[PDB]
Coordinates of C-alpha atoms in Angstrom, one line a residue:
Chain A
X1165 CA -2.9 -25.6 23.2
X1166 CA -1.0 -22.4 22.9
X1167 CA 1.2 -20.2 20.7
X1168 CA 3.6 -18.0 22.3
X1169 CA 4.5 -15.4 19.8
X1170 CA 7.6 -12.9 20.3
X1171 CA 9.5 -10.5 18.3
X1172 CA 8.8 -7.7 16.4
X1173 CA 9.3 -3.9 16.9
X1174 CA 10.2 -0.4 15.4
X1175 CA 13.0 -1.1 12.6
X1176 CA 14.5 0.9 9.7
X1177 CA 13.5 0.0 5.7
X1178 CA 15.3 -2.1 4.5
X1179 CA 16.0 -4.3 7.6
X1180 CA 15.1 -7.5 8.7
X1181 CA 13.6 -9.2 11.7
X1182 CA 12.4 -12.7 12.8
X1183 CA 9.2 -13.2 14.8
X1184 CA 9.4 -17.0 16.7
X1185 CA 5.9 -18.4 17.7
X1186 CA 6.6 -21.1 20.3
X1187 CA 4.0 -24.2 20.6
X1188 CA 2.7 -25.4 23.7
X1189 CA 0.1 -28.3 24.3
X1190 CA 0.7 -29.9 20.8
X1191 CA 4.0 -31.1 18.1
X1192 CA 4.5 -29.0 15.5
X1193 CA 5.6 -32.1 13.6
X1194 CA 2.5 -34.2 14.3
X1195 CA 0.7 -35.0 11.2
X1196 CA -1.8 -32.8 9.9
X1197 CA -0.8 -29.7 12.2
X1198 CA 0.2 -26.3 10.0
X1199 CA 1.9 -23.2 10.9
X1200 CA 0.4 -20.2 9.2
X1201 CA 0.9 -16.1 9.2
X1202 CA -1.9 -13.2 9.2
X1203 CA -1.2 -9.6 9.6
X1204 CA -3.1 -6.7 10.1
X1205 CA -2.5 -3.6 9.1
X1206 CA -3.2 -0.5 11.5
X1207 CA -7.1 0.0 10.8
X1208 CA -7.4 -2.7 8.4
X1209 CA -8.4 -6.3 8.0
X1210 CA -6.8 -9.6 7.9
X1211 CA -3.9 -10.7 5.0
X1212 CA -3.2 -14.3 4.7
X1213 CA 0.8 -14.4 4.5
X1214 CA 1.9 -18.2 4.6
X1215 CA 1.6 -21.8 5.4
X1216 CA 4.2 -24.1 6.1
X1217 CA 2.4 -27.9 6.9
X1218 CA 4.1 -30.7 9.1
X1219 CA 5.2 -32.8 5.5
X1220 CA 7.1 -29.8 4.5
X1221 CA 4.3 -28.0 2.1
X1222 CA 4.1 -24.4 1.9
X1223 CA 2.4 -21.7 0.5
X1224 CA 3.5 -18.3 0.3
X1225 CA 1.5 -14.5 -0.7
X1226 CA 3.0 -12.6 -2.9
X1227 CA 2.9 -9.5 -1.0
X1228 CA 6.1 -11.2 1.0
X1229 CA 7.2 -14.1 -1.9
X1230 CA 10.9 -13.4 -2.3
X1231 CA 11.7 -11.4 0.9
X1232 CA 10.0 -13.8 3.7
X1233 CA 10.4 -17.6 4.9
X1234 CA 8.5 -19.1 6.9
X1235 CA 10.0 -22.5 9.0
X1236 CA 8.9 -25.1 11.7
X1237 CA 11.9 -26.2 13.9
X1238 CA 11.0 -29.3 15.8
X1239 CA 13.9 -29.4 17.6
X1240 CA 12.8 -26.2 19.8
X1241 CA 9.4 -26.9 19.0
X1242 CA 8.9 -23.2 17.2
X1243 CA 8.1 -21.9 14.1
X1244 CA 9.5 -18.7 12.7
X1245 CA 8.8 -16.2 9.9
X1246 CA 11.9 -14.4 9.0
X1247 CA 11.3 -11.1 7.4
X1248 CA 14.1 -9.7 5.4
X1249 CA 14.0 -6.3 3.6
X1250 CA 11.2 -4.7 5.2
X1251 CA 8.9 -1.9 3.6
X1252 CA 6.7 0.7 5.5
X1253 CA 4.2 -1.3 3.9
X1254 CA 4.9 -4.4 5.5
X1255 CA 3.6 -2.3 9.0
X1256 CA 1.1 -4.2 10.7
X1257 CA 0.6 -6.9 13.6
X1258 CA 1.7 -10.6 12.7
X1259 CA 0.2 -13.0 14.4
X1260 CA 0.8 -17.0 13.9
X1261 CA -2.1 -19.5 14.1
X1262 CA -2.2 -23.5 14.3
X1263 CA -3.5 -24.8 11.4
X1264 CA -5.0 -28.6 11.2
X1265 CA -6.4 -31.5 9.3
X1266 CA -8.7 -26.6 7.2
X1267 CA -9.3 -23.5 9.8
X1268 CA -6.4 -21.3 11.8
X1269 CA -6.9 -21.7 15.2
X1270 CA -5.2 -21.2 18.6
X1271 CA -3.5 -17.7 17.3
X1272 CA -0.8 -16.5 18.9
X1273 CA -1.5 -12.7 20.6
X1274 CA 0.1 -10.7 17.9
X1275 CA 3.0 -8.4 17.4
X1276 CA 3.5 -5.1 15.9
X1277 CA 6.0 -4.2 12.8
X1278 CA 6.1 -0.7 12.5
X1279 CA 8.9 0.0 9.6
X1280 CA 10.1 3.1 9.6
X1281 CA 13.5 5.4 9.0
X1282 CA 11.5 8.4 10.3
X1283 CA 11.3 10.7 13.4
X1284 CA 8.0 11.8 15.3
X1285 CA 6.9 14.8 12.6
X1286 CA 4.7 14.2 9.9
X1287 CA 5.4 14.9 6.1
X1288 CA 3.6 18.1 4.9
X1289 CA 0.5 17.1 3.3
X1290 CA -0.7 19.2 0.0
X1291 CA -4.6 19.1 -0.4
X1292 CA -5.4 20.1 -3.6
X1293 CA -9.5 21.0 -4.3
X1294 CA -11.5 19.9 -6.5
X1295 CA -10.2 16.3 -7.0
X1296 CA -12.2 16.8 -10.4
X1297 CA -14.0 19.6 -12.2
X1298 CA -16.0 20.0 -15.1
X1299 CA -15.2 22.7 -17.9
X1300 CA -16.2 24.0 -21.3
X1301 CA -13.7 25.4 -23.6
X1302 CA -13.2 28.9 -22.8
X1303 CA -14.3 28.4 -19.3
X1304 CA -12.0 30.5 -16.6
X1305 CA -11.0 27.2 -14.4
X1306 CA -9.4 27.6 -10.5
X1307 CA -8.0 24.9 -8.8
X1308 CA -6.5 25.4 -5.2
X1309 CA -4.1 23.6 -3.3
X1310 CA -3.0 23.8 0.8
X1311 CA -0.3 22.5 2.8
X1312 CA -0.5 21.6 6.0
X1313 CA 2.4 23.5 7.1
X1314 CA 4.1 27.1 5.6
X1315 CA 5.4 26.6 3.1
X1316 CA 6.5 30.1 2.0
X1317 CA 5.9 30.2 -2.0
X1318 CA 8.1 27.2 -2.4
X1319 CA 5.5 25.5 -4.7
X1320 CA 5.2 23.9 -8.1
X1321 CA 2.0 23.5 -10.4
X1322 CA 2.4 20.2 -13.2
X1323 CA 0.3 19.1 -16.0
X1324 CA -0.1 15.6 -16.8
X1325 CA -2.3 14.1 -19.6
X1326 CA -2.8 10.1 -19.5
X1327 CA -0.1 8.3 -20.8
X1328 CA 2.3 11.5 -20.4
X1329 CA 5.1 12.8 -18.1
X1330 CA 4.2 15.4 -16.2
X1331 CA 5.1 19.1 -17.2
X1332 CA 6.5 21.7 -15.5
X1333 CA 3.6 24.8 -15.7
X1334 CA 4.4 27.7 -12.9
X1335 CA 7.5 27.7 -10.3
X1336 CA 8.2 29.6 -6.5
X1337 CA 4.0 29.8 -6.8
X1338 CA 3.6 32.5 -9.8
X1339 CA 6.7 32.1 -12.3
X1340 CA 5.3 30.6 -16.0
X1341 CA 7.8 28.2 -17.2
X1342 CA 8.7 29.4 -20.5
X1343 CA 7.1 27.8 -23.4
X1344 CA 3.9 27.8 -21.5
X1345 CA 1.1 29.5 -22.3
X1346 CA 0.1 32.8 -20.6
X1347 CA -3.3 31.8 -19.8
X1348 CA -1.6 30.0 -17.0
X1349 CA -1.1 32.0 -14.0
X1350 CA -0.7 31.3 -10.1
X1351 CA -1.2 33.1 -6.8
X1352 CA -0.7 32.6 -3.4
X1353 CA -3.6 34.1 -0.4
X1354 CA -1.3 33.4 2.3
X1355 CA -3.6 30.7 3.9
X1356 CA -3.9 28.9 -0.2
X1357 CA -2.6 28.7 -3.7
X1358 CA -4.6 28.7 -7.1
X1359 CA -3.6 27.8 -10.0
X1360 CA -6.1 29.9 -13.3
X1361 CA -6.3 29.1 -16.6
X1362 CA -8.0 32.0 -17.7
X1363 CA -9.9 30.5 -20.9
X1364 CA -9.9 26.9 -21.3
X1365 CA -8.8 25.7 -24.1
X1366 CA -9.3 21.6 -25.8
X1367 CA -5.4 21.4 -25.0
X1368 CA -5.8 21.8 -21.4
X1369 CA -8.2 18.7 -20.4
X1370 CA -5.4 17.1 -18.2
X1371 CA -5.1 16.2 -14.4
X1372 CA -2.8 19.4 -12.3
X1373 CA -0.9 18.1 -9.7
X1374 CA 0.9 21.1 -6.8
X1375 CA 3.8 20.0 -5.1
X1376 CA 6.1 21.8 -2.4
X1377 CA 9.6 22.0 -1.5
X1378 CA 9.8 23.5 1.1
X1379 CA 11.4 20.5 3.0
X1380 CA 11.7 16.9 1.9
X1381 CA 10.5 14.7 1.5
X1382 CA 8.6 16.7 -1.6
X1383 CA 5.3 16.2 -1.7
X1384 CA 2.4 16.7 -4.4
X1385 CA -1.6 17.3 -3.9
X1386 CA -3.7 14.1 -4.8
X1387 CA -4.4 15.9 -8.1
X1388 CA -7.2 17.8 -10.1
X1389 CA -9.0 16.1 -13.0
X1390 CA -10.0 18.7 -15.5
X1391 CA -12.5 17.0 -17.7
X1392 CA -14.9 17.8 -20.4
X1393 CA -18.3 19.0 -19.7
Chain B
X803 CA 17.3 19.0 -23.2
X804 CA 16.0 15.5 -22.5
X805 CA 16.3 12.5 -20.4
X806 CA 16.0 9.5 -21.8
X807 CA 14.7 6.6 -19.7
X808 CA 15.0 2.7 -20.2
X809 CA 14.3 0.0 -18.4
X810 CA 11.7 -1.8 -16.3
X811 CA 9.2 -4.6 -17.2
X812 CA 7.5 -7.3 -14.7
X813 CA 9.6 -8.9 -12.0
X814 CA 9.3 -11.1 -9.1
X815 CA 9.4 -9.9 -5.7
X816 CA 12.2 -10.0 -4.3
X817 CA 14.1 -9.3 -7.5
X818 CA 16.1 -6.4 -8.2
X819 CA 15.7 -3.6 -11.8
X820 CA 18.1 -1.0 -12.8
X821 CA 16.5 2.1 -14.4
X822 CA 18.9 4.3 -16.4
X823 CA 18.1 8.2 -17.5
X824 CA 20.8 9.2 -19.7
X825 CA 21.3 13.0 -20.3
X826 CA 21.1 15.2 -23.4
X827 CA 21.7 18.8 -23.9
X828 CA 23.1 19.4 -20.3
X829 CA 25.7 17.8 -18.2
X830 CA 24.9 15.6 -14.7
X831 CA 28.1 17.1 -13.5
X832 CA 27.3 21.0 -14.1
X833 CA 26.7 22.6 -10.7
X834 CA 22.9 23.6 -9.8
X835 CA 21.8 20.0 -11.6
X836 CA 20.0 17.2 -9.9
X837 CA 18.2 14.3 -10.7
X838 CA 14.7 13.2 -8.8
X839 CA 13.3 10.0 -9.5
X840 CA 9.4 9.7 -9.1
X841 CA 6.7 7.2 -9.1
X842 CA 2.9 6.6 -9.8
X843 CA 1.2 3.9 -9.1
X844 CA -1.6 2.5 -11.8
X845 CA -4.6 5.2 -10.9
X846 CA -3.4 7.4 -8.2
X847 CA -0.8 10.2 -8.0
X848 CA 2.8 11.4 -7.6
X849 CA 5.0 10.8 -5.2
X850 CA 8.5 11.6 -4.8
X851 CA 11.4 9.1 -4.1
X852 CA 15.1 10.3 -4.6
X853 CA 16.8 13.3 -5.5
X854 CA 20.6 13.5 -6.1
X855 CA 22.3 16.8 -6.7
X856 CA 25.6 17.4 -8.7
X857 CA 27.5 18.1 -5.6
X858 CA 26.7 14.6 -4.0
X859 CA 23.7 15.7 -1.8
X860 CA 21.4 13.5 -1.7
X861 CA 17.8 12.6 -0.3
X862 CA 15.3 9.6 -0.4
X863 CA 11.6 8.8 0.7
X864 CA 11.0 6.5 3.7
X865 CA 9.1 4.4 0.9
X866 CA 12.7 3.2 -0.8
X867 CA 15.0 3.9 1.9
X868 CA 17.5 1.1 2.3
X869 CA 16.3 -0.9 -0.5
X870 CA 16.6 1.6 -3.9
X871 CA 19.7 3.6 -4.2
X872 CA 20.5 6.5 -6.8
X873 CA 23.5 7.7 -8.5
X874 CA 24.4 9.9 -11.4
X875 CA 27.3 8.7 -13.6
X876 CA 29.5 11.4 -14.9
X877 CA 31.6 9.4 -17.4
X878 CA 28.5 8.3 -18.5
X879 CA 26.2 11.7 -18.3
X880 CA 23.6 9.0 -17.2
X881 CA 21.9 8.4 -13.8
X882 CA 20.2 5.2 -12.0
X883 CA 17.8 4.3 -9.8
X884 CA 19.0 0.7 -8.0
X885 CA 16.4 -1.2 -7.2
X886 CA 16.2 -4.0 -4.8
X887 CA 14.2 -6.5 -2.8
X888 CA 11.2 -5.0 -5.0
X889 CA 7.7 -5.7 -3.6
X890 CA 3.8 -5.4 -4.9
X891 CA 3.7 -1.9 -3.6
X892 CA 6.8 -0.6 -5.4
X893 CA 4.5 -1.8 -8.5
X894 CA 4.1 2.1 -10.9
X895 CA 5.3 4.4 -13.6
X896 CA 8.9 5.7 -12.6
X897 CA 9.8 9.0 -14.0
X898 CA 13.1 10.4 -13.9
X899 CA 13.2 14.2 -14.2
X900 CA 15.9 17.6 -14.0
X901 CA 16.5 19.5 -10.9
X902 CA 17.8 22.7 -11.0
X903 CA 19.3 25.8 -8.8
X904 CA 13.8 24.3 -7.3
X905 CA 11.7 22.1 -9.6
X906 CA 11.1 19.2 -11.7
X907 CA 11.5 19.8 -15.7
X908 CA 12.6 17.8 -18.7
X909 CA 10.8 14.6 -17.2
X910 CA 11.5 11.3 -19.0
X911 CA 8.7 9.6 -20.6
X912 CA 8.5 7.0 -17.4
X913 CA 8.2 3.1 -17.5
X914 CA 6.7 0.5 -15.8
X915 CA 7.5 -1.2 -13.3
X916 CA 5.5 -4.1 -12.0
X917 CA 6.6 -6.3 -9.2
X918 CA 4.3 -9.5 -9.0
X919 CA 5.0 -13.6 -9.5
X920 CA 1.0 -14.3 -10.2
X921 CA -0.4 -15.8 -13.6
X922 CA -3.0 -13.6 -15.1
X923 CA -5.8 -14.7 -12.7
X924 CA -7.1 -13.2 -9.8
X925 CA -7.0 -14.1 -6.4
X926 CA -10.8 -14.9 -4.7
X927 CA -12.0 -11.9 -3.4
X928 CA -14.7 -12.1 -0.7
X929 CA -17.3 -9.6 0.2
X930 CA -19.4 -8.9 3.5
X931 CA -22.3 -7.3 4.0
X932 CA -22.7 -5.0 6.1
X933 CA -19.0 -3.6 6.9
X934 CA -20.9 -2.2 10.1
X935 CA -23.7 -2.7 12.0
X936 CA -25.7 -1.4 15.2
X937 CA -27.2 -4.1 17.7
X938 CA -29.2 -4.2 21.3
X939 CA -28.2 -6.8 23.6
X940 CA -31.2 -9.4 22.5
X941 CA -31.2 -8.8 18.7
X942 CA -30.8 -11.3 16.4
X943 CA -27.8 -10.2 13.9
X944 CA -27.0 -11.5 10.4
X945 CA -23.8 -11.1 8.5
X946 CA -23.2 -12.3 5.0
X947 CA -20.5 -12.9 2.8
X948 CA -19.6 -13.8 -0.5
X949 CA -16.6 -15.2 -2.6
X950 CA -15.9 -14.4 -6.6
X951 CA -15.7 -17.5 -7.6
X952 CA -17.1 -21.5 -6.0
X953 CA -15.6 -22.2 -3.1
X954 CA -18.0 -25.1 -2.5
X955 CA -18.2 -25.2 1.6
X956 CA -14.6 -23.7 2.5
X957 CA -15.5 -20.8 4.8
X958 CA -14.4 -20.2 8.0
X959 CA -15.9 -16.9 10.6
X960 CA -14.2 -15.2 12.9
X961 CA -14.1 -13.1 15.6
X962 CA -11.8 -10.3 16.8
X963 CA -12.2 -7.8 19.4
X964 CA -10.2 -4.3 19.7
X965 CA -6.7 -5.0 20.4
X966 CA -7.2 -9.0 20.3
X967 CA -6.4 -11.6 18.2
X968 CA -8.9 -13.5 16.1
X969 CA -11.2 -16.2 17.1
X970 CA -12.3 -19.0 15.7
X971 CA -16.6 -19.5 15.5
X972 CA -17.5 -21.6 12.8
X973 CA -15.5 -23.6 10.1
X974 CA -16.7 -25.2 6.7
X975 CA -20.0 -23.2 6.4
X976 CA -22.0 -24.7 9.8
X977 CA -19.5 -26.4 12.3
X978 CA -19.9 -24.1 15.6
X979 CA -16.3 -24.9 17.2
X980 CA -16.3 -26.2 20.4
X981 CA -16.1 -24.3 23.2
X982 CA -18.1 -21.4 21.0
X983 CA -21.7 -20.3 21.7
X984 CA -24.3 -22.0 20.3
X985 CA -26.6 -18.7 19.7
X986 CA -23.6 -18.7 16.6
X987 CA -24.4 -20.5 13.8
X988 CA -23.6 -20.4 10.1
X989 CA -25.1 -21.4 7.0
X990 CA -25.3 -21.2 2.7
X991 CA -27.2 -20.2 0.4
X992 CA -25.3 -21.5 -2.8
X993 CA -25.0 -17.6 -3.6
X994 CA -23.4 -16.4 -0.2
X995 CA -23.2 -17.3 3.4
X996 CA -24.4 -16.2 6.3
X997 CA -23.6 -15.9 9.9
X998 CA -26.6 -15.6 12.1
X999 CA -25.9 -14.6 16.0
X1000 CA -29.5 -15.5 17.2
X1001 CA -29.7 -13.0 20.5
X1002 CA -26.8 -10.9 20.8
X1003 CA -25.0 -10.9 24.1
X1004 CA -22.6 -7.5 25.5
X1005 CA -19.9 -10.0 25.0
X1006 CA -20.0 -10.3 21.0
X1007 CA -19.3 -6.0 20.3
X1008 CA -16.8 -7.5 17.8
X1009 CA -15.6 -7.2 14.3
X1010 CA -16.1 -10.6 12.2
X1011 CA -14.3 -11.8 9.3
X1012 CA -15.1 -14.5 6.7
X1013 CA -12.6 -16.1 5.4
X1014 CA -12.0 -19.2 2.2
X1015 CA -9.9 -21.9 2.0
X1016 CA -11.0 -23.1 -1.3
X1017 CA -7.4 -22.2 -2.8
X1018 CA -4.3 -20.7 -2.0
X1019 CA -3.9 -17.4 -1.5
X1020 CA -6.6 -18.2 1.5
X1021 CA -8.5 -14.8 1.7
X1022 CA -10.7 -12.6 3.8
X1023 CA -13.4 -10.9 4.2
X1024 CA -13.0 -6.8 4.9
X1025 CA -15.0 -7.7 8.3
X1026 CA -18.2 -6.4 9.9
X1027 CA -18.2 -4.2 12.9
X1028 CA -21.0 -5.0 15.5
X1029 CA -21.2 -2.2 17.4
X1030 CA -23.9 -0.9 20.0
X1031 CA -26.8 1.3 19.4

């Protein structure tokens, strides 16, 4: 028994593609024989996808519910998952086992979906540090953020406290936004940015969040929890 | 100034949501405006996903490319974000906020947006222990697992080298399938299970996964890397 999988590729978001897994050695309309789908993302482990069963059953995940099918066509003898409006995180290798009666055996080799509208670069990471801090009121409180390109002083410091928007603080690195307060500065080292608040006060316990634009895509640092001590 | 945001709520994947972010105190049409649409997802950070600008430039993430589209209405002084063909991962806060001639002010107060067709339960979640381990050639190895909820004897181990697909060792608990090394074998405890290789061989430098069949969705294990000393 063997499954011959084929298909896949490089293909932009929003697209669609249909992976075929051909059956040798066996009928995919013999009772008790199953079709089933398993990806893997790049590093990752295994996702159960679908089922499809000889009397018609399925079962579907709901990571693709809505967007994929899955079918047995025993006229060629070849089942198929059809994927329709693909996601960069649908990326991973599909592979299509045999199913039987309940274990998936016989996989087929795997193919890799890689969705993507990009070129070869890479988006410019912002690394903010620390991820959280500790503070007092009236502390002096630093945070720093990097990104992994220049970025000039194209770069925007946010406030957000749970449940809330975000706020605008500083702009082009050291401008206040008006309306905020002065103990809010920023600065730039040439290698870093910081972001002081030069005395702490109870209305500042929030999470701070850089972000450049430089280029898009716009990107922010993971963000910096400023919690009580 | 504000925007003011509506829309939203829990949808199936595969279904489509229109967000609106209707303008006050400034016009969509006045040049130097833009509109940036951003999302969070439920504990992590920002990231961007559209920007539209009053002269029709426009730019989107690889994330929503070909699926979400966004516009700004002029008769209307309102913008949209079009979303389609939503998935799991699309599932966050979206915030609408002003762009101006470069940065993100007067954000809207953001809403939900959950993409999912589950009840309120949870799906079985299995655990392994170790996620690595280092072996000789000779040594007897032990990997256990365990699911969230009973799954009676429905557990199946695998196999999977680097660049492979998955293997089959051992299904319901204890049945070594054929063809498979005896030196595997499996067992439970009625609190976990366990898959015992009794004298490791070069051959079985692999990454194995448990994996349940109790219930749909059938799940996995994160796997355990057996790796040389």
């Amino acid at each position: 028994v063997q499954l011959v999988e084929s298909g896949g590729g490089l293909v932009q978001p929003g697209g669609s593609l249909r992976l075929s897994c051909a059956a040798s050695g066996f009928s995919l309309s013999t009772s008790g024989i199953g079709v089933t789908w398993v990806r893997q993302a790049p590093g990752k482990g295994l996702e159960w996808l679908a089922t499809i069963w000889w009397d018609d059953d399925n079962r579907y995940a709901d990571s693709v519910k809505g967007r994929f099918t899955i079918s047995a066509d025993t006229s060629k003898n070849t089942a198929y998952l059809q994927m329709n409006s693909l996601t960069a995180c649908d990326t991973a290798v599909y592979y299509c086992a045999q199913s039987a009666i309940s274990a998936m055996d016989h996989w087929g080799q795997g193919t890799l979906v890689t969705v993507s509208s990009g070129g070869g670069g890479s988006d410019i990471q912002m690394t903010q540090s620390p991820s959280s801090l500790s503070a007092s009121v009236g502390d002096r409180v630093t945070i720093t953020c990097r990104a992994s390109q220049d970025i000039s002083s194209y770069l925007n410091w946010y406030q957000q406290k749970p449940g809330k928007a975000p706020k605008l603080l500083i702009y082009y690195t050291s401008s206040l936004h008006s309306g905020v307060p002065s103990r809010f500065s920023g600065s730039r080292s040439g290698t870093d940015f910081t972001l002081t608040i030069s005395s702490l006060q109870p209305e500042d316990f929030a999470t701070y969040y850089c972000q450049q634009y430089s280029k898009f895509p716009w990107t922010f640092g993971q963000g910096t929890k400023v919690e009580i001590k």
